[PDB]
Design a binder for these strands. Structure first.
Ligand SMILES: [Mg+2]
Ligand SMILES: [Mg+2]
Ligand SMILES: [Mg+2]
Ligand SMILES: [Mg+2]
Ligand SMILES: [Mg+2]
Ligand SMILES: [Mg+2]
Ligand SMILES: [Mg+2]
Ligand SMILES: [Mg+2]
Ligand SMILES: [Mg+2]
Ligand SMILES: [Mg+2]
Ligand SMILES: [Mg+2]
Ligand SMILES: [Mg+2]
Lengths: 196, 107, 100, 141, 203, 48, 191, 173
RNA sequence: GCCAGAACGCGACGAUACUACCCGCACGUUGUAGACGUAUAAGAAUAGGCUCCGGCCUCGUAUCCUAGCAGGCGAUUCCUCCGCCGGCCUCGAAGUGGCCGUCGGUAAUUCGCGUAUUGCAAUUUAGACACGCGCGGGAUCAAAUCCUUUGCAGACGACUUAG
RNA sequence: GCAUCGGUUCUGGCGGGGGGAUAAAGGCCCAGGGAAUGUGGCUCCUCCGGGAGUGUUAUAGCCCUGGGUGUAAUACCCUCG
């Protein structure tokens, strides 16, 4: 697969604009200024051209959507942006749906529902440099072991003459990408519900 | 107005040196002439001059283009490849490069 | 350095005496040192180069030999154009096979 | 019962079949030796088409569309020549397209430098009229 | 023999090893080669034979670290052909690296080599090399069964390019008919002397 | 000589590059298979 | 040894047409149309008489010649299926548990589907879908019989084989537990 | 190799006790007369108490085929040594000469039984005058009446130096 | 499905101050695994095909192009081809070709002047890919890192944040 | 660079001579004898190509043997240029 083109909304908020910067505080914040002019020039001719190209050629349609992190108690102000695939309908239907959703909020109850089995993708809790005993769950060596018992006693035979990739070694533990699957949704509670 | 070419030479390719399986001899080179596919055809080109034309860095005496001259000595094998002897052995980076087989010693 | 083709031009009207006196050994190189000296005097001292003058005797012999030769050549329908046009090798031209 | 079969139709290796050899000569088959060799002779008056009586390996031969009818098996050179002249194998061969192609190849190989220049000139002169006709046809659409 | 700027070889109907040998010789001699439709190349013998050969190949892997040094098993048909050619090229020298750089291999016919003349190599054609009735398999099928992920995409794109080629061929046939008519019409306007001279010369 | 008493290996080689994740945000490496007969719908979301 | 000529002939009755192009045989008659791709065999087809198809192999070995009669029989089977059809009759056999069979034609596809329940008294229902062009029915003439009819002998026999193979007893003395569905009669629809 | 039939006539060296010794004639298929004489001495050692040192070659002549332009069926009775014994076998060939039949015999024995030249003895070569005395089916099918056949899937002749072709060749000629 | 992501694999998008981007010429000090007519799209079968539907198919041994000071000047005569820029209309496997116009040059025929002296051969320095430049304009007026901060992180780097 | 030479060598053509069964063959001209994968006829069948049978050159031919043109050519081996 390859992305042929992408179309952006006329106005982007500072939350999502912060994602495009490393030093937003001291920058000129010019992220999409020239792109915004395309909606005014020639009555959005280029925007319509790109949308028609997506309709004509592309077989997979995704929306670029960002979080409203300012509504969370988090100290972070830079929003998270990602591609969400549109499933169902034709490519024209997908394009129309995505375009109608431009600079518009979608609530999670329109995406998921109660008693649905979903998957959660995230980076796990990070531990630092960790030895083999906790990183791989190996057996602790006896108490009277010289030069350390929190180790693997034999890290390889003689004849291959290399430490092999299958031998447990100390290193980074945690902070790994994980896609945990088959989690049931027990409730989708609303923020405005005082008794959710 | 004269849409014709100007080529008076036959093109060839510098294949390799004369060699065994492991020992090579740069003093003679193997040349594949276009359209020459047998010993009988190769016999026509025996004694013909050959030029290896290449470009260098400095302009020495009015040009950046240098020439190594030699001549076709004898046929090689059964498929029209010929042996060629040059004034100096060819650079051996020119394996696969082009050479010009003239017609200067004609008939 | 020539390839002899099978076309032969008639030579009945050509002056054999003229041909031999042109073929005399000193005909082409007798004046060469002086022409080169004159060319050097023109180029080094002067600022702009000009064509070497053709000797009157050589021009006269050229005309005298070429008159009857051209007259003979005109009798062959396309021979004049053939002699005017240059020779070159095209794709697929195999000199070991071309009859000339 | 309507039957539509569109399989290939080869020429048969048979007594009387005329083969064209690699040198350009013709030989009629008088007897089949095995799967790969035959006995053949070309008793043609034209020296360019005649072959001596002998064994012809079928790998070196091409089957012409000419078959001498009712040629006896194992017929000697005299009978083969009688049938050859009676059938007029030389004329039929000359009328075949293979002979015309060979003649064209010989003519093109026999060209000299002046011949090639004249061919270029005449082809340009004919191409002028061909281009005019093609432009007229294109304009008519 | 003839020296070309680049030779485009339609890989369909060719035997893998023989085409690889020819291509490697040409590359080392200095010819540039682009091979298209590598998924239509042929291997003699049963597909089960080919699959067993590739499984034996896949079994090979560096024991101590599979991320380095080990035989990296390329699944695409163009990469299978490239492996066959690199076997016949001295790829560990600068000369061999240049010879391999003179080569391009593709699945299907990408647009640049679409609308270009695709040659064939009779010394490697299956119909000219294999006894009829003998089994053979397809490099595309072998690649699909060993893990090549784009068999259907290539098929769809080839169908599209064949439809475009069919339209081109229709217009080509129209042009050929018009040219034949033009020659027939001009045959009555050229000099009969010119016509006879050309016929005698062989044209 | 052979390992005296059999025991399964510790850990899985299916997660073997036990390195830090390349990006903080999780990556959707596969989306559910599309079905044109269904109504248009988004296949994912983000939260905290 | 390679035989110079191996020949075979197929007579074509008056009511049907046969077309062979690129070794793709098409047979059309009163009961329908059948096609068979024979491009994997090096055979030469021709018309030898008014209604006789000749098929021959030249310079073939024993292995090659063995396929000539196979091709003849296959094309003859296509012809007889196109003219008279093929009909297979199966019998249910059991010792204690009556085999329950339900056959219906799919709505979204033309294929028939057969569900077998109560085989050897187990609760799994086994479903087998017929090849297209094959019709299955419960025999009205006699009990515990299935009728499969069609134009292609290959498809009819393969559907019957699927039904027969889907009903097997495992981890038992097969000499004692004979329950199953077995093909009992092979013939033609007509006569 | 390329052979030729030789009549080789040899003789025991004449002695006082036996003047005018018997003359022995053999037909030898050999590439040259040196090999012909060698084979003659080998077979004469096998058959009689004569050696090359105690004998001489009276004559060596070439026996040319009298009708090399006539197709004939030949039967060859031969004795040969396998890896595990000695066997006699009779084979048939279709050739225009005895020499061609013998060459085909040598090639066929080498191809089918891995029999080298050193391990074959040609007992007899006979031209089968009639047709009904042809015993092998692979000769019978060649002498079948009104014999004719096509040549399917024939590869056209292409120069091995013409690496690339602009159109796909056909195999119908 | 799942993990890593080629640190010399690829795509889309955003902003791009400047020596960075765009337009035309002005050279080329600089480079090339190697121009010299760097000319040719059907698909498919090979125990069959192509077609103009008449007929053709071993054969690319083909077709196109190919003349003129390295290709001049002026006529005769030609309406045929080559390009240069502009409307547009279609080309997503790694963005392609076209018919519609301008502006040029143009032996299909026949000629009239010029060619010389490069001295009897000596690469026929002639092309396209670039790349780095200077002319003299248009366009544009940006980021990143250090630093301070956070702890979803961490041996140090790095990472998630904020200024 | 060319021309004319010398030494070594590779390679392509051309004109002759000798030998063998004075090649074997073959083409014509006779003299005799045969057969079939039996030509023409004749008989029957098939009318739908054609098939079967009979018998020895006829409205095709072939095989075997003895001769002449003939010291024919050729191709093989040798050899003089
Ligand atoms: Mg634990
Ligand atoms: Mg201790
Ligand atoms: Mg594994
Ligand atoms: Mg690496
Ligand atoms: Mg039991
Ligand atoms: Mg990367
Ligand atoms: Mg104009
Ligand atoms: Mg920490
Ligand atoms: Mg000398
Ligand atoms: Mg009769
Ligand atoms: Mg005499
Ligand atoms: Mg003689």
């Amino acid at each position: 697969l390859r992305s042929l083109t992408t179309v952006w909304a006329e106005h982007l908020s500072d939350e999502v604009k912060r994602r495009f910067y490393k030093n937003w505080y001291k920058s000129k914040k010019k992220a999409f200024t020239k792109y915004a002019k395309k909606y005014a020039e020639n009555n959005g001719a280029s925007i319509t051209r790109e949308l028609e190209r997506i309709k004509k050629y592309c077989t997979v349609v995704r929306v670029l959507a960002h979080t409203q992190i300012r509504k969370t108690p988090l100290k972070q102000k830079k929003a998270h942006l990602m591609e969400i695939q549109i499933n169902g309908g034709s490519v024209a239907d997908k394009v129309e749906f995505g375009r109608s959703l431009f600079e518009k909020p979608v609530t999670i109850d329109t995406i998921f529902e109660k008693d649905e089995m979903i998957d959660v993708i995230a980076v796990t809790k990070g531990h630092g440099f960790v030895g083999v005993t906790a990183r791989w769950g190996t057996k602790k060596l006896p108490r009277k072991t010289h030069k350390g018992l929190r180790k693997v006693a034999c890290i390889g035979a003689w004849h291959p003459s290399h430490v092999q990739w299958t031998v447990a070694r100390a290193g980074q533990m945690g902070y790994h990408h994980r896609t945990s699957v088959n989690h049931k949704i027990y409730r989708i509670g609303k923020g405005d519900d005082e008794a959710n | 107005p004269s849409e014709a070419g100007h080529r008076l030479y036959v093109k060839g390719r510098h294949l390799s040196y004369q060699r065994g399986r492991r020992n090579t001899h740069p003093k003679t080179s193997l040349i594949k002439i276009e359209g020459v596919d047998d010993t009988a055809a190769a016999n026509f080109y025996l004694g013909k001059r050959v030029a290896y034309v290449y470009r260098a860095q400095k302009e020495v005496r009015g040009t950046k283009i240098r020439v190594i001259w030699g001549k076709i000595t004898r046929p090689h094998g059964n498929s029209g490849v010929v042996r060629a002897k040059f004034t100096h052995p060819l650079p051996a980076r020119s394996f696969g490069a082009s050479v010009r087989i003239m017609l200067y010693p004609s008939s | 350095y020539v390839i002899a083709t099978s076309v032969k031009v008639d030579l009945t009207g050509v002056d054999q005496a003229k041909i031999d006196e042109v073929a005399q050994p000193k005909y082409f190189t007798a004046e060469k040192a002086k022409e080169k000296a004159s060319e050097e005097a023109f180029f080094k001292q002067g600022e702009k180069p000009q064509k070497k003058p053709v000797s009157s005797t050589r021009a006269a012999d050229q005309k005298a030999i070429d008159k009857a030769l051209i007259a003979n050549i005109k009798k062959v329908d396309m021979l004049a154009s053939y002699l005017a046009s240059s020779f070159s090798l095209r794709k697929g031209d195999k000199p070991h096979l071309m009859k000339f | 019962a309507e039957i539509n079969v569109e399989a290939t139709s080869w020429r048969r290796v048979e007594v009387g079949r005329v083969l064209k050899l690699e040198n350009g000569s013709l030989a009629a088959i008088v007897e089949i030796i095995d799967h790969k060799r035959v006995l053949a002779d070309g008793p043609s008056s034209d020296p360019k088409l005649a072959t001596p009586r002998g064994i012809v390996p079928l790998s070196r031969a091409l089957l012409t569309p000419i078959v001498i009818p009712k040629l006896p098996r194992g017929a000697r050179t005299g009978a083969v020549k009688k049938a050859w002249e009676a059938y007029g194998v030389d004329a039929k061969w000359k009328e075949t397209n293979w002979a015309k192609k060979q003649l064209q190849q010989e003519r093109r190989q026999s060209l000299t430098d002046f011949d090639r220049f004249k061919v270029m000139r005449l082809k340009k002169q004919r191409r002028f009229e061909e281009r005019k006709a093609l432009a007229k046809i294109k304009a008519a659409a | 023999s003839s020296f070309e700027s680049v030779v485009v070889i339609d890989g369909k109907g060719h035997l893998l090893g023989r085409l690889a040998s020819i291509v490697a010789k040409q590359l080392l001699s200095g010819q540039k080669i682009v091979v298209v439709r590598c998924e239509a190349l042929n291997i003699s013998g049963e597909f089960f034979r080919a699959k067993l050969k590739y499984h034996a190949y896949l079994r090979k892997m560096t024991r101590y670290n599979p991320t380095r040094g080990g035989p990296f098993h390329f699944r695409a048909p163009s990469r299978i052909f490239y492996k066959a050619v690199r076997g016949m090229i001295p790829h560990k020298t600068a000369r061999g690296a240049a010879a391999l750089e003179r080569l391009k291999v593709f699945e299907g016919v990408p647009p640049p080599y679409d609308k270009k003349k695709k040659m064939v190599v009779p010394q490697a054609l299956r119909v000219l090399r294999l006894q009829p009735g003998r089994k053979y398999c397809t490099v595309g099928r072998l690649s699909h069964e060993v893990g090549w992920k784009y068999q259907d995409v290539v098929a769809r794109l080839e169908e599209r390019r064949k439809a475009k080629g069919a339209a081109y061929y229709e217009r080509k046939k129209l042009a050929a008919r018009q040219l034949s008519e033009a020659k027939k019409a001009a045959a009555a306007k050229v000099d009969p002397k010119v016509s006879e001279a050309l016929a005698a010369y062989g044209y | 000589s052979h390992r005296k008493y059999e025991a399964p290996r510790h850990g899985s080689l299916a997660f073997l590059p036990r390195k830090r994740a390349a990006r903080h945000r999780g990556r959707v490496k596969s989306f559910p298979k599309d079905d044109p007969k269904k109504p248009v719908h988004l296949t994912a979301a983000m939260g905290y | 040894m390679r035989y110079i000529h191996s020949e075979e002939t197929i007579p074509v009755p008056e009511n049907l047409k046969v077309s062979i192009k690129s070794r793709l045989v098409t047979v059309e008659g009163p009961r329908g149309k059948l096609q068979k791709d024979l491009s994997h065999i090096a055979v030469n087809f021709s018309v030898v008489k008014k209604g006789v198809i000749g098929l021959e192999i030249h310079h073939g070995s024993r292995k090659d010649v063995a396929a000539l009669r196979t091709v003849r029989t296959i094309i003859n089977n296509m012809i007889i299926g196109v003219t008279k059809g093929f009909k297979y009759k199966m019998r249910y056999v059991y010792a204690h548990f009556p085999i329950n069979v339900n056959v219906e034609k799919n709505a979204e596809t033309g294929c028939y589907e057969v569900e077998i329940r109560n085989f050897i008294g187990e609760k799994i229902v086994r479903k087998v879908v017929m090849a297209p062009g094959v019709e299955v029915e419960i025999s009205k003439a006699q009990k515990d019989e299935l009728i499969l009819s069609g134009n292609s002998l290959e498809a009819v026999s393969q559907s019957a084989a699927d039904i027969q193979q889907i009903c097997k007893v495992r981890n038992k003395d097969i000499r004692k537990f004979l329950d199953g569905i077995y093909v009992s009669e092979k013939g033609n629809i007509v006569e | 190799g390329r052979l030729q039939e030789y009549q080789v006539i040899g003789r025991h060296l004449p002695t006082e006790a036996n003047p005018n010794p018997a003359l022995y004639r053999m037909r030898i298929f050999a590439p040259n007369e040196v090999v012909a004489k060698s084979r003659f001495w080998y077979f004469l050692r096998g058959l009689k108490k004569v050696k090359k040192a105690t004998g001489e070659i009276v004559s060596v002549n070439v026996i040319s085929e009298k009708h090399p332009l006539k197709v004939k069926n030949f039967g060859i009775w031969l004795r040969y040594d396998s890896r595990s014994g000695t066997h006699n076998m009779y084979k048939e060939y279709r050739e225009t000469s005895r020499v061609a039949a013998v060459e085909a015999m040598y090639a066929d024995m080498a191809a089918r039984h891995r029999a080298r030249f050193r391990s074959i003895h040609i007992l007899k070569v006979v031209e089968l005058e009639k047709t009904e005395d042809v015993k092998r089916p692979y000769i019978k099918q060649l002498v079948a009446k009104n014999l004719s056949f096509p040549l399917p899937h024939r590869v056209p002749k292409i120069s091995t130096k013409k690496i690339f072709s602009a159109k796909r060749p056909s195999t119908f000629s």
